[PDB]
């Protein structure tokens, strides 16, 4: 999510600068750390899904805002339903041609072809209100975004006034989400590293104690000893060539 690449660097020791800091000199309460991460994570995954959902709606609607406006002008009958218009974006005027051929040859001469430049090409076919099913099969099979009204905000007259107000609700909703996302990225970026290091040591602690029976039949000597709090720092700094030295 954060757009951050994998951090490993493999430290349990408190001697070093980064050691002291990303790994506490305090003890390890395994429950506490798990909890710290679980709750933030629940918010974050919910957040990302939302961001994506909101972003796709805003993007569709922003694109087709202008589409319906252009189509209304090509004169007040595209807020109504006296005739059928097919609004649509297509990326190539080339594909527009092939559709025009299919159209003329085989369904007669019944299109009004108008076009507007987008950043795509805005194509307009206009057809009867009884032969609408037949235009869709043509449009769909060559892939065009030719729907009768590309906006789903049809529900008052003018239709464009409803489109404008959902684009108004969308644009701010999106803003807030992004704001929530940044601060949270900032906030747990540092923590994510510090927790990663913590966990490595938890996996080790269990292993030292023996958490399954293979660990018992692996090292048969288990000894006990006392290292005071300060010296504890230098004890993990060295590691032997076979020794796993417990912190706290």
């Amino acid at each position: 999510k954060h757009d951050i690449k994998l951090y490993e660097g493999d430290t349990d020791k408190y001697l070093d600068g980064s050691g002291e800091l990303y790994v506490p000199p305090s003890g390890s309460v395994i429950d506490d750390y798990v909890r710290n991460a679980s709750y933030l994570e629940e918010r974050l995954i919910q957040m990302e899904d939302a961001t994506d959902q909101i972003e796709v709606q805003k993007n569709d609607l922003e694109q087709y805002r202008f589409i319906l406006q252009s189509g209304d002008e090509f004169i007040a009958a595209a807020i109504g339903a006296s005739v059928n218009y097919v609004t649509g974006v297509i990326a190539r005027d080339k594909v527009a041609t092939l559709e025009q051929i299919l159209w003329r040859v085989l369904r007669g001469n019944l299109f009004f072809k108008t076009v507007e430049i987008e950043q795509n090409a805005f194509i307009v076919f206009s057809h009867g209100d009884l032969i609408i099913k037949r235009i869709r099969k043509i449009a769909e099979s060559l892939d065009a975004n030719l729907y009768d009204v590309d906006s789903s905000n049809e529900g008052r007259s003018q239709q464009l006034a409803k489109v404008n107000k959902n684009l108004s609700d969308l644009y701010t909703v999106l803003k807030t989400t992004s704001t929530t996302l940044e601060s949270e990225l900032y906030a747990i970026a540092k923590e994510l590293d510090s927790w990663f290091q913590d966990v490595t040591r938890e996996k080790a602690i269990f292993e030292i104690l023996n958490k399954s029976n293979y660990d018992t039949n692996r090292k048969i000597l288990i000894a006990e000893g006392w290292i005071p709090r300060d010296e504890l720092a230098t004890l993990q700094a060295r590691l032997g060539e076979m020794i796993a030295r417990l912190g706290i």
Partner: protein
């Protein structure tokens, strides 16, 4: 094609729409004349039976 060519076809479009509809509309009103007579004979035969 050119706007002119597309306007020749436009003219053709409203020609089609109008012609199939006049053709439809003649059949539609011809069923309406068969229906007038037939309904009229049916009301009458029912009623004279009652009067009888």
């Amino acid at each position: 094609l050119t706007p002119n060519q597309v306007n020749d076809e436009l003219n053709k479009m409203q020609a089609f729409i109008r012609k199939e509809a006049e053709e439809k509309a003649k059949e539609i009103q011809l069923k309406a004349d068969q229906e007038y007579e037939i309904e009229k004979t049916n009301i009458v035969r029912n009623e004279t039976n009652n009067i009888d």
